Amino acid sequence: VRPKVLMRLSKTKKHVSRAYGGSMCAKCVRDRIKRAFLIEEQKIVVKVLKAQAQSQK
Amino acid sequence: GRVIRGQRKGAGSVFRAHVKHRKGAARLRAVDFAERHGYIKGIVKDIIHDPGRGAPLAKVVFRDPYRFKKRTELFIAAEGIHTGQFVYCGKKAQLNIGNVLPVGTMPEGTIVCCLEEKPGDRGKLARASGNYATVISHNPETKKTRVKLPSGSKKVISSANRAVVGVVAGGGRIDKPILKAGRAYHKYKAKRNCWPRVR
Amino acid sequence: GAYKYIQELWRKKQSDVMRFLLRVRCWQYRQLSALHRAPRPTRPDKARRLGYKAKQGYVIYRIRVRRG
Amino acid sequence: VVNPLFEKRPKNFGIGQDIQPKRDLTRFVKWPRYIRLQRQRAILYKRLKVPPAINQFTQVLDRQTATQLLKLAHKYRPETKQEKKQRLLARAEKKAAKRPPVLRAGVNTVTTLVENKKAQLVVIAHDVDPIELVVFLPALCRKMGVPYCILKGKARLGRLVHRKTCTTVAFTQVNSEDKGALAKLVEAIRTNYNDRYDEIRRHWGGNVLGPKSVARIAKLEKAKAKELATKLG
Amino acid sequence: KIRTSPTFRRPKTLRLRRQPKYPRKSAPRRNKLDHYAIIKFPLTTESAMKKIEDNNTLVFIVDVKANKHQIKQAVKKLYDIDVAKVNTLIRPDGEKKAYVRLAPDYDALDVANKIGII
RNA sequence: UGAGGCGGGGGGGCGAGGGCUCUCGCUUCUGGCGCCAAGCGCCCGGCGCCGGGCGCGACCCGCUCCGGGGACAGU
RNA sequence: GAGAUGGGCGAGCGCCGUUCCGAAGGGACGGGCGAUGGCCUCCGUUGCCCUCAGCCGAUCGAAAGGGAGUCGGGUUCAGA
């Protein structure tokens, strides 16, 4: 609808029940979740490889 | 007894630049703490076409290091850049196409574009379609550096001022002949009232 | 009183003291606007010699004119 | 004992790692035009070769003796506006039924009693804005043999005489019990200002380079001194 | 105290309230747009009568500078009849004409005879 | 440039041979997130309970906001 | 595109310029304190101290651009 109409409608007509719903498509949300978990685990994998760096040097 | 045409062009108001649809000022990212010491990571949000400018522009998005806010700059697309590819900016930035870093760190025979000609002026040299600049010689003392320019003249510029690596995109724009006066009419219409030139 | 001294001191505009004090004010005045009110007169000697008296209602405006 | 949910979460302030905290920025503020001017006019009093007639007010009286100077003078304050009308009602009854010595303020009254050599100690203020109003004075008290000194602050000088400020204050006469109290001030002052004259006439203040430059010469003055210190050995 | 922002903004200073030692005008000017300078006269048009019989509205020539609100309460005071809606326009000759639609519990005829027009 | 970490001086971390000279003050695989302090210490205010402050975290010191020119441009 | 303030120029009426040589915000939240109003309850009013703020250029500029929301039937010598 035209932008000013959005005052009239209720909430559920303007969004969808999901995290980032109504703003991001679901496909680019599961991609965002899959990303934001794998990057953090890559930080933990390197954090115990750096922990095994100065254990020698 | 009459003011000639080339004399009227400095008054403007008919020979002014047509800047209604121009995207913005194609500059670098200003000097700050990160750019001097470290590197700062930026995403290429998308690539766009600036009317009048033969090169394409690039919307790079950085994360501001002092406020919780994302800052966006308009870069001059080095050829080979694609969206989503990360651009790194600063002294400690790695050397790979599409990366700004001061000339004094880059080695000899490096091919750069969007070069600065005064430290902290956000790029002025070699920023047309397909024009690059080569860093010839260095000088640790005096912080100077000889750089040949797309015209052929070499300029002794300081080493603190930076440039983005690679050649400017849109190269080879001048190989395709204009065939008709219509195409030439449409090109100069996007830039300024100059085209049909009476001898 | 002292005004005779300051009078005779201001006639020595090529001496080291005056050539110091004039090059400072000329720098200081230059970093301001072209028309602004001085609180108290720069030359109290020349002021009273021109009719200035220190009393409520006497005002002094320091202004710069582009020479040439 | 302690709740094990209390976990220390650091913020790594690296380059582009986390956002910098609200650290102090009182060095890079774009100050207003009037403050910016207010300071770099003081740098000019530490850059250019200040002539000796103006440099001579940087050298000032020390603190611990200046507390004696004002306290001695704190009884010699002239009569206030309130005591003036009370000193005119005393005369109002002596018809209906000697003045002690006081201070002397104002340059145009002090110089008129320095030329007559009536003063004993002329106190000046180092911070008068159109400095031309004073600069003749210390060279003239020395000539006619009147002990002078320079006190830091025309405001606290202008607190004895109840005004906003004052430039000079003179001791024409004193009492007898404070007579010798003055004598110990004169000798300690004359040995620093009057007899110390020829040194003051040739003291050029300023010619100092900035701390960002004297550290730049020295980094090349220590490096040059690093070469010739191990060449012979 | 420290500086967090690298800029300098002017501080908020105590700006007092206007407290004059004498009123600039000794007398408050009386409202020249009162209730009688706001309704000049009704209409005696063969169309205005048609407007009275059928649509139950009165037609006045009100002043050129009156709101619909002001016209509504003016009639409500001069003729003690409540107004349902007002419609105004400006005739070409210049004076403003007003169609005062009376409330349905009121009658436009028997109040038109209260003021003579018929 | 939203004048945001300038010059010094101390500090730890990576080396050849415990001081001095040197590198460094923590980010590169991915179209993710990032602010409005965690935590510790020293005090105080309200009937064991409920509410506050300063400091470390975020080193200290300074005179031009940093840069580039400059007694020449310029007027 | 037009055009004030700051600034700059100008013998001068004035001109230049529009973010550029500028202390360019009269706001919001929270907290604290005194105070009033109605069952001074609770909320609202009000000051002061504390707290956070990017604002970025006054203002003008379209009856074809942007711009929430009316349609059906009847009625007049002329208006829907």
Curated annotation (Swiss-Prot), chain A:
Give Gene Ontology CC terms. cytosol; endoplasmic reticulum; ribonucleoprotein complex; ribosome
Q: Which domain of life is it from?
A: Eukaryota
Provide this UniProt record's keywords sorted from A to Z: Acetylation, Cytoplasm, Endoplasmic reticulum, Isopeptide bond, Phosphoprotein, Ribonucleoprotein, Ribosomal protein, Ubl conjugation
Q: Which GO terms describe its biological process?
A: translation
One MF term from GO for this chain?
Answer: structural constituent of ribosome
Q: Where in the cell is it found?
A: Cytoplasm, Cytosol; Cytoplasm; Endoplasmic reticulum
Covalent link location (Glycyl lysine isopeptide (Lys-Gly) (interchain with G-Cter in SUMO2)): K50
Record keyword NADP present: no
For this UniProt entry, what is the primary localization, expressed as one broad class?
A: cytoplasm
Q: To which protein family does this belong?
A: Belongs to the eukaryotic ribosomal protein eL34 family.
How does the record describe its quaternary structure?
A: Component of the large ribosomal subunit.
Role played: Component of the large ribosomal subunit. The ribosome is a large ribonucleoprotein complex responsible for the synthesis of proteins in the cell.
The name under which this protein is listed is Large ribosomal subunit protein eL34
Q: Which organism is it from?
A: Oryctolagus cuniculus
Q: What range of the intact protein is shown?
A: 59 to 115 of 117
From Swiss-Prot, chain B:
The stretch of the full-length protein covered here is: 2 to 200 of 257
The entry's cellular-component GO terms read: cytosolic large ribosomal subunit
Instruction: Tell me what this protein is called.
Output: Large ribosomal subunit protein uL2
Q: Where in the cell is it found?
A: Cytoplasm
- For this chain, the site of the Glycyl lysine isopeptide (Lys-Gly) (interchain with G-Cter in SUMO2) cross-link is K41, K148
Print the keywords alphabetically. Answer: Cytoplasm, Hydroxylation, Isopeptide bond, Ribonucleoprotein, Ribosomal protein, RNA-binding, rRNA-binding, Ubl conjugation
* Entry annotated with the keyword Cell inner membrane: no
Q: Which organism is it from?
A: Oryctolagus cuniculus
Q: What is its main location?
A: cytoplasm
From Swiss-Prot, chain C:
One cellular component term (GO) for this entry is:
cytosolic large ribosomal subunit
The signal peptide stretch is none
Residues annotated as carrying Phosphoserine in the record are: S33
Does the record's keyword annotation contain Phosphoprotein?
A: yes
| Major site of localization recorded for this protein | cytoplasm
For this UniProt record, give its keywords in alphabetical order, as a comma-separated list: Cytoplasm, Isopeptide bond, Lipoprotein, Myristate, Phosphoprotein, Ribonucleoprotein, Ribosomal protein, Ubl conjugation
**GO molecular function list:** RNA binding; structural constituent of ribosome
- Does Ribonucleoprotein show up as a keyword for this record? yes
Residues bearing a lipid moiety (N-myristoyl glycine): G1
Subcellular location per the Swiss-Prot or TrEMBL entry: Cytoplasm
Task: Report the record's Gene Ontology biological process terms.
Answer: cytoplasmic translation
Q: What family is this?
A: Belongs to the eukaryotic ribosomal protein eL15 family.
Summarize the subunit comment: Component of the large ribosomal subunit. Interacts with IFIT1 (via TPR repeats 1-4).
Q: What does this protein do?
A: Component of the large ribosomal subunit. The ribosome is a large ribonucleoprotein complex responsible for the synthesis of proteins in the cell.
Q: What is this protein called?
A: Large ribosomal subunit protein eL15
> Per UniProt, what is the name of the gene that codes for the protein in this document?
RPL15
Q: Which residues of the full protein are shown?
A: 2 to 69 of 204
From Swiss-Prot, chain E:
Residues of the region (Beta-like import receptor binding (BIB) domain) are: 1-36
What is the annotated localization of this protein? Cytoplasm; Nucleus
Residue numbers carrying Citrulline: R3
Record's comment describing the protein's domains: The N-terminal beta-like import receptor binding (BIB) domain mediates interaction with IPO5, IPO7, KPNB1 and TNPO1.
Q: What is this protein called?
A: Large ribosomal subunit protein uL23
How it assembles, according to the record, is:
Component of the large ribosomal subunit. Interacts with LYAR and GNL2. Interacts with MDM2; this interaction may promote MDM2-mediated p53/TP53 polyubiquitination. Directly interacts (via BIB domain) with IPO5, IPO7, KPNB1 and TNPO1; these interactions are involved in RPL23A nuclear import for the assembly of ribosomal subunits. Interacts with IPO8.
Question: What family does the Swiss-Prot or TrEMBL record give for this protein?
Answer: Belongs to the universal ribosomal protein uL23 family.
The reply on keyword Acetylation is: yes
Source organism, top-level taxon: Eukaryota
Modification sites for Phosphoserine: S5
Gene of origin? Answer: RPL23A
Q: Which GO terms describe its molecular function?
A: rRNA binding; structural constituent of ribosome
Say what the protein does: Component of the large ribosomal subunit. The ribosome is a large ribonucleoprotein complex responsible for the synthesis of proteins in the cell. Binds a specific region on the 26S rRNA. May promote p53/TP53 degradation possibly through the stimulation of MDM2-mediated TP53 polyubiquitination.
Any Gene Ontology biological process: translation
Q: Where is composition skewed (Basic residues) in this entry? A: 1-29
One Gene Ontology cellular component:
ribosomal subunit
Q: How is it modified after translation?
A: N-terminus is methylated by METTL11A/NTM1.
Keyword Ubl conjugation applies: yes
Residues where Phosphothreonine occurs?
T7
- N6-acetyllysine-modified residues are K32
Arranged from A to Z, the UniProt key words for this protein are:
Acetylation, Citrullination, Cytoplasm, Isopeptide bond, Methylation, Nucleus, Phosphoprotein, Ribonucleoprotein, Ribosomal protein, RNA-binding, rRNA-binding, Ubl conjugation
